[PDB]
Amino acid sequence: SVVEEHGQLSISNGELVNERGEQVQLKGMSSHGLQWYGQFVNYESMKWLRDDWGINVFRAAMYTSSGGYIDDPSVKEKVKEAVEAAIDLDIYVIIDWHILSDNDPNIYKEEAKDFFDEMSELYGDYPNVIYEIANEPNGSDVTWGNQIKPYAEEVIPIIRNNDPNNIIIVGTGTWSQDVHHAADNQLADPNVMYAFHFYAGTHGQNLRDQVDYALDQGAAIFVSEWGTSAATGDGGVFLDEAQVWIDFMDERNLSWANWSLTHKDESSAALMPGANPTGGWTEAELSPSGTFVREKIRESAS
Numbered sequence: 329s330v331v332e333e334h335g336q337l338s339i340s341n342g343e344l345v346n347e348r349g350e351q352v353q354l355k356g357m358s359s360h361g362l363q364w365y366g367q368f369v370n371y372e373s374m375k376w377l378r379d380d381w382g383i384n385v386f387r388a389a390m391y392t393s394s395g396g397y398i399d400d401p402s403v404k405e406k407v408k409e410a411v412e413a414a415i416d417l418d419i420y421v422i423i424d425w426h427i428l429s430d431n432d433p434n435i436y437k438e439e440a441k442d443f444f445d446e447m448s449e450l451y452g453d454y455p456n457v458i459y460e461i462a463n464e465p466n467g468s469d470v471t472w473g474n475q476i477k478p479y480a481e482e483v484i485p486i487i488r489n490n491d492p493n494n495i496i497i498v499g500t501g502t503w504s505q506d507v508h509h510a511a512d513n514q515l516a517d518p519n520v521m522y523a524f525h526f527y528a529g530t531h532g533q534n535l536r537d538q539v540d541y542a543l544d545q546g547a548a549i550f551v552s553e554w555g556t557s558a559a560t561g562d563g564g565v566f567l568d569e570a571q572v573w574i575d576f577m578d579e580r581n582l583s584w585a586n587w588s589l590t591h592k593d594e595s596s597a598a599l600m601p602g603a604n605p606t607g608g609w610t611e612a613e614l615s616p617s618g619t620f621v622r623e624k625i626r627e628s629a630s
């Protein structure tokens with residue numbers, strides 16, 4: 329019913345809107361690296377997330393490096409499974425070319441173009457699909473002007489050749505935090521959004537103000553990844569500051585996906601070690617982070 333209701337999404341003056349031009353706010357979960365935790369991404373778990381949590385978007389995090397797609401492209405099968413599950417469950421789905429240690433998106437440009445050509449040819453006619461062409465550019469020598477914008481200017485046309493209208497999310501500098509630099513030199517494609525990522529235990533008002541600067545320049549922002557923990561991964565979760573960020577996003581109608589749906593023993597993980605991979609979780613199988621996120625999504629779901 330999510331996609332049946334909103335249909336084709338588009339950007340209108342920086343806002344994500346549905347086919348009737350009404351505002352749409354997506355809230356969902358990101359998987360962790362599919363090469364490590366792909367078992368948690370399947371029809372049943374996505375259905376449980378849809379039905380029990382109220383998600384309306386699922387983010388498939390396909391690492392390029394770290395035993396990801398570059399070395400083992402078979403992980404692409406897991407991406408297809410997720411996309412097909414999303415189409416069957418009628419929710420939106422983000423295909424994330426998840427760069428991280430390969431901090432300049434131009435490292436695997438040729439491969440990214442080939443991957444997005446294939447995905448857009450296969451799924452471009454479905455409104456459910458959203459492309460995230462470079463998770464988190466990072467490093468002092470990777471900037472919007474020299475590396476990221478030119479990379480997007482090459483990948484977007486590849487996608488547009490097959491899919492003229494689905495949303496494309498583009499990463500920004502400093503682990504997708506530098507949305508102000510991007511907002512000052514925006515892409516021409518109308519259905520683009522810039523990624524903003526944060527950690528509730530580390531990022532506060534300064535970054536919120538940075539996000540507002542970007543919004544004030546007419547840029548559309550998708551919080552395609554955010555954690556409840558500290559970047560250090562120490563001290564547990566920080567739900568007080570997470571709630572400040574949730575409110576901030578609601579005021580501005582910002583869409584978001586939480587990191588992450590895994591049983592890994594790290595504060596940002598939504599699940600406890602051993603949690604059932606196909607869903608149907610008991611409250612005992614959810615971590616404090618997972619319990620909080622589930623409530624945020626449920627409490628705003630219809």
Ligand SMILES: [Ca+2]
Pocket residue numbers: none
């Ligand atoms: Ca099956």
Ligand SMILES: [Ca+2]
Pocket residue numbers: 445446449
């Ligand atoms: Ca082609």
Ligand SMILES: [Ca+2]
Pocket residue numbers: 452453454455491492493494
């Ligand atoms: Ca399309």
Ligand SMILES: [Ca+2]
Pocket residue numbers: 482
């Ligand atoms: Ca080029």
Ligand SMILES: [Ca+2]
Pocket residue numbers: 464503525553
């Ligand atoms: Ca991150």
Ligand SMILES: [Ca+2]
Pocket residue numbers: 351353581
């Ligand atoms: Ca709203």
